[PDB]
Ligand binder design. Structure first.
Ligand code: NAG
Ligand code: NAG
Ligand code: NAG
Ligand code: NAG
Ligand code: NAG
Ligand code: NAG
Ligand code: NAG
Lengths: 50, 49, 285, 99
């Protein structure tokens, strides 16, 4: 999408496997803000916006 | 219905055993009846209480 | 596509008695030959429920009995419909139905079931549309004027497509579908049971144990619902979208659950074969 | 986006993944791990939230397609179905008594 027309990707009812994001070699920034990326495998949420 | 007392004794024993077993799922004024959940999801003092 | 239908007179509805029905499995615990006594929401035995009529006969002098009122939802609804041409084809469970609060839309249209949870602007008389043809003789679902607008939705659900009968067969009813709708702790658990029937009048006697079907975690405050029927608009009745619609022949029963103790009787395999209540009479107590 | 500028005038596809908690029950979460099926031994088991200690024999109690647990006239855990494979087990404590 564009900068002024950012499209959301609200998705739920799944099994989020976060072990594929930080275990990759194709990104440049992974500065999470107080979410404990290595501890995301034991925290449940309702909706994940993208 | 001839051996009434012999059956009544066994029935009373079975009822006593069933009551003794069922007396384990009571709160007795506590939060819950399961001890591990009490000692895990509560502070040490109240858990011991 | 809202349209206020006309040519529908008024008549006080009847009340049919429920003969020992409304017993479901409270939990998923296996018990063999155990006379367990549980306490949960059930339907009191020998209690009469509201009988909604939906028929269109030549003897009716333009009555066109097509009932679908907005019924309340206190604790549960023992929905039981004796249909023969698939008239009851979904529900519009909601809270306000004025495009302000979400509403659980469970409708099984021609393709499949779509359990959608969104904010919709429902009309004053929601229904489905099936048009009959005189050239190829094929019933096709065309009108779907349930809602009028959408908004930001929530968790939904779909299924694989299939095809139903969709034919106006003549004779007595041959199907019976029971349902129990409870909503506690943000869990809208739904029970279901399909048993054959060969009766043409009020709900017969018997006993059946309803099994859990779905447990969609919607988390809403549904307190008032309504039914989704279907008409039989064909070449016989002429007119427009407001007049000239058929009603077929069907009937659905609606009950209300109340908290009361029940005594269940599990068989040697795990199915409930009989039960008794705890306040119908001194012998029951 | 001319392919002749520096390293400060290039496209950067950024993701804004966020997390929040509503009042509805959680439906999306992380994965879970599973161990091996060690039967015929007094061990500790935790299938879906229940605890206990005892051997896990292979009984013949046929459960219903929707039922998961199993009890008796004493209202105690006696048989729990395995989550992975549809095999009904049986929970009985090991040997205990006086000497
Ligand atoms: C049906 O009637 C109600 C109230 O009489 C009205 O608010 C509504 O707009 C009507 N529907 C249509 C399609 O005009
Ligand atoms: C039917 O139910 C209604 C409840 O509104 C009440 O009149 C009574 O309990 C029943 N009456 C008859 C005639 O069965
Ligand atoms: C039935 O509903 C599904 C889901 O919205 C839709 O794709 C399909 O076109 C519908 N079928 C008819 C006949 O309206
Ligand atoms: C059946 O006839 C109706 C009447 O025009 C037509 O609309 C429909 O497409 C026909 N269907 C088939 C499968 O021929
Ligand atoms: C949907 O939109 C309404 C109004 O914009 C808002 O109040 C609500 O929080 C949104 N999300 C929902 C209903 O999940
Ligand atoms: C219980 O299950 C067994 C095993 O199939 C069967 O033989 C028996 O008839 C069942 N009991 C019923 C259906 O009452
Ligand atoms: C889980 O996977 C194993 C093999 O990886 C398979 O044997 C088992 O049937 C699977 N469970 C389900 C419920 O499909």
């Amino acid at each position: 999408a564009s900068v002024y027309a950012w499209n959301r990707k609200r998705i739920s009812n799944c099994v989020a496997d976060y072990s594929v994001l930080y275990n990759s070699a194709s990104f440049s920034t992974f500065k999470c803000y107080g979410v404990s990326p290595t501890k995301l495998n034991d925290l449940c949420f309702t909706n994940v916006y993208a | 219905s001839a051996l009434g007392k012999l059956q009544d004794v066994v029935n009373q024993n079975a009822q006593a055993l069933n009551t003794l077993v069922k007396q384990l799922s009571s709160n007795f004024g506590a939060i819950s009846s399961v001890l591990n959940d009490i000692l895990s999801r509560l502070d040490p003092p109240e858990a011991e209480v | 596509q809202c349209v206020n239908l006309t040519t529908r007179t008024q008549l006080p509805p009847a009340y049919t008695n429920s003969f020992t029905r409304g017993v479901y499995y409270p939990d998923k615990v296996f018990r063999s030959s155990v006379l367990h006594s549980t306490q949960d929401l059930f339907l009191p035995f020998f209690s009469n429920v509201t009988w909604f009529h939906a028929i269109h006969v030549s003897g009716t002098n333009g009555t066109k009995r097509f009932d679908n009122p907005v019924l309340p939802f206190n604790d549960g609804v023992y929905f039981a419909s004796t249909e023969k041409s698939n008239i009851i084809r979904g529900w519009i469970f909601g809270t306000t139905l004025d495009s302000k609060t979400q509403s659980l839309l469970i409708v099984n249209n021609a393709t499949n079931v779509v359990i959608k949870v969104c904010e919709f602007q429902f009309c004053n008389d929601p229904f489905l549309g099936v048009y009959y043809h005189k050239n190829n003789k094929s019933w096709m679902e065309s009108e779907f004027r349930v809602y009028s607008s959408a908004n930001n939705c929530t968790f939904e659900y779909v299924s694989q497509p299939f095809l139903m009968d969709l034919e106006g067969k003549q004779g007595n009813f041959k199907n019976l579908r029971e349902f129990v709708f409870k909503n506690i702790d943000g869990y809208f658990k739904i029970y279901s049971k399909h048993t054959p029937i060969n009766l043409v009048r009020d709900l017969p006697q018997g006993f059946s144990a309803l099994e859990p079907l779905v447990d969609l975690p919607i988390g809403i405050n549904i307190t008032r619902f309504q039914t989704l029927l279907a008409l039989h608009r064909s070449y016989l009745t002429p007119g427009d979208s407001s007049s000239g619609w058929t009603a077929g022949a069907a009937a659905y029963y609606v009950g209300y659950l109340q908290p009361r103790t029940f005594l269940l009787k599990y068989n040697e395999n795990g199915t409930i074969t009989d039960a008794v209540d705890c306040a119908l009479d001194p012998l029951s107590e | 986006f001319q392919p002749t500028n520096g390293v400060g005038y290039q496209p950067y596809r950024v993701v804004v993944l966020s997390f929040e908690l509503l009042h509805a029950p959680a439906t999306v979460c992380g994965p879970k791990k599973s161990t091996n099926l060690v039967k015929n031994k007094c061990v500790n088991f935790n299938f879906n939230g229940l605890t206990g200690t005892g051997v896990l024999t292979e009984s013949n109690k046929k459960f219903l397609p929707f039922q998961q647990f199993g009890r008796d006239i004493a209202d105690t855990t006696d048989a729990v179905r395995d989550p992975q494979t549809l095999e009904i087990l049986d929970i009985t404590p090991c040997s205990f008594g006086g000497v």
